[PDB]
Design a protein around this ligand. Structure first.
Ligand SMILES: OC[C@H]1NC[C@H](O)[C@@H](O)[C@H]1O
Ligand SMILES: [Mg+2]
Lengths: 416, 208
């Protein structure tokens, strides 16, 4: 479809109904959206949980919303209100919305080292106390911010031990299940990883829940890549494709904004740098000020990124390509005017017998405060299973299915 | 006058060094010595401000960092806005300097001394908040058979825009002439005149 022009990621091109199908029954008067936000004092000893709830259907005077916060079996905070926002402008406010503020003393903070979660329950009910419907999510208290050139979680500078991961299974193709997700997360943590980059699209919704519970930082990425265009920004600099691109970013933020594990939004991958990127960068900073935005395209340090995020820049050697140079990482930090932190969105290409020179990145990451780590390329080899004449399975790569043209073994880049 | 005619850039330095004090800023943090220090800076600027070869003023050398330095820094910026001011004391990047100007910082290796660390020069440029250029006020100590590793500074100076070079220590050996019994001249260093205590050959650090 014309959506295919935006989906040129380096991976098997497959098709079909590859994630779950459900029916959902809601009442006619329903919760239609809710957002959770956490604000802190200077030393993280007091928090405010702010919940915004929106409803659809017929507004009545007797409707109420309650938000309660649970730690295990103990209720820790609670608030109730009728519908009706504060005045927003000259025409009034939202009659079909309400904001609760809940105070929490000495909250247990979420991080990848100690993933403490609370449970928020949101109830729509009548004044006499008949329940209409409930919704719920897991809440982690954490603050992500960029302060004086450093990316801080809960006031401390992060060191990202990350990997890029595709959704890939050698028998089932791009179909993901709970068992494989859990196997990946255990192996990642057993090997000292704390972070994963969703290369290069939103994941199955269960993935974010498991990263909340086990503790990994997530970079969540919009499904936009136009690598095969000449030049790379032919579509992303064209206002007629701004509608298509905006749906890919806005719907991702609206689905995933409540997960504590998501700490950074990404605008996509390898699409050059066009005016559509700057517009969408600004859209996210305005609807969700709580997470940084990153984007590698167009030379890794454009106005559409809060973080300098090169791919495959070297530690000591410059690669001075026209228009989009890859400075060495130590030099990049100190270019006249530069103040952002640097995290490699891809480094150390793990293709085959590889990772020579890996120690030299880790020596730099520990010596320089504004080098805060990176994401290895990548977690798992994308090979598929074929059968021979005797029915013996063997691992196949590009070209083994009569697909043409193809890029041969270049699909196998994993640590596993 | 000769640097104007032949073409050299000059850094002109106030006659203030209190290296032997404990701590180094005992006098330069004391308001009773602010009169004495101000005469040394103000009279130098009033004598030399018309020479085109002078491009940078320096507040002195190895005197720690005291409030008298910040006051005199501000005095020069106000009477002569046309030249930057530099000062190495107190860890090379205080509020009394327009230029980060370390002495003997290395290219790749940190030297993490308490209070006054010497970062490696590539790392220093990129410390959170740092925006000034870096010029070494002394590097590559030329004592005797020396200058090993000199090429590694010049490779860094050419690769990084904000590393803008430095001043070698130093031009000429400070040795003196003595005569033997036959009247033959020989080169003498500390201790050869019955001076005591003394610091021996440490006065000979030159390229010539
Ligand atoms: O394997 C090379 C690697 N280069 C960079 C891209 O972002 C990845 O998708 C992949 O194609
Ligand atoms: Mg690509």
């Amino acid at each position: 479809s014309d959506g295919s022009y935006l989906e040129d990621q380096d991976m098997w091109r497959m098709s079909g109904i590859f994630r779950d199908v459900s029916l959902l029954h809601k009442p006619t008067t329903q919760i239609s959206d809710f957002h959770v936000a956490t604000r802190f004092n200077d030393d993280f000893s007091r928090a405010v949980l702010e919940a915004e709830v929106q409803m659809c259907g017929e507004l009545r005077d007797y409707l109420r919303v309650t938000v309660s916060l649970w730690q295990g079996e103990t209720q820790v905070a609670s608030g109730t209100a009728p519908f009706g926002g504060e005045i927003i402008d000259e025409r009034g406010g939202y009659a079909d919305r309400v904001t609760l503020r809940l105070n929490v003393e000495n909250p247990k903070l979420w991080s990848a080292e100690i993933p403490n979660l609370y449970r928020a329950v949101v109830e729509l009910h009548t004044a006499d106390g008949t329940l209409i419907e409930a919704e719920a999510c897991d809440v982690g208290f954490r603050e992500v911010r960029i302060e004086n050139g450093l990316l801080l979680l809960n006031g401390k500078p992060l060191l990202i031990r990350g990997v890029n991961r595709h959704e890939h299974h050698p028998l089932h193709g791009q179909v993901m299940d709970e068992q494989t997700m859990v196997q990946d997360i255990l192996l990642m943590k057993q090997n000292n990883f704390n972070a994963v980059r969703c290369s290069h699209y939103p994941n199955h919704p269960l993935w974010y829940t498991l990263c909340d519970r086990y503790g990994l930082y997530v970079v969540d990425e919009a499904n936009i890549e136009t690598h095969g265009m000449v030049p790379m920004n032919r579509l992303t600099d064209d206002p007629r494709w701004l509608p298509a691109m905006s749906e890919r970013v806005t719907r991702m933020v609206q689905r995933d904004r409540n997960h504590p594990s998501v700490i950074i939004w990404s605008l996509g991958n390898e699409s050059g740098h066009g005016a559509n990127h700057d517009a969408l960068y600004r859209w996210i900073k305005s609807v969700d000020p709580s997470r940084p935005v990153q984007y590698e395209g167009g030379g890794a340090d454009t106005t559409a990124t809060d973080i300098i995020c090169p791919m495959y820049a070297r530690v000591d050697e410059d690669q001075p390509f026209p228009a989009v140079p890859k400075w060495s990482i130590k030099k990049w930090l100190s270019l006249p005017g530069e103040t952002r932190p640097l995290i490699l969105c891809e480094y150390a290409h793990a293709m085959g017998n590889s990772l020579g020179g890996f120690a030299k990145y880790w020596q730099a990451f520990r010596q320089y405060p504004r080098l805060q780590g990176g994401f290895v390329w990548d977690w798992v080899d994308q090979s598929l299973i074929k059968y021979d004449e005797n029915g013996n399975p063997w691992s196949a790569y590009g070209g083994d299915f009569g697909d043409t043209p193809n890029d041969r073994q270049f699909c196998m880049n994993g640590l596993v």
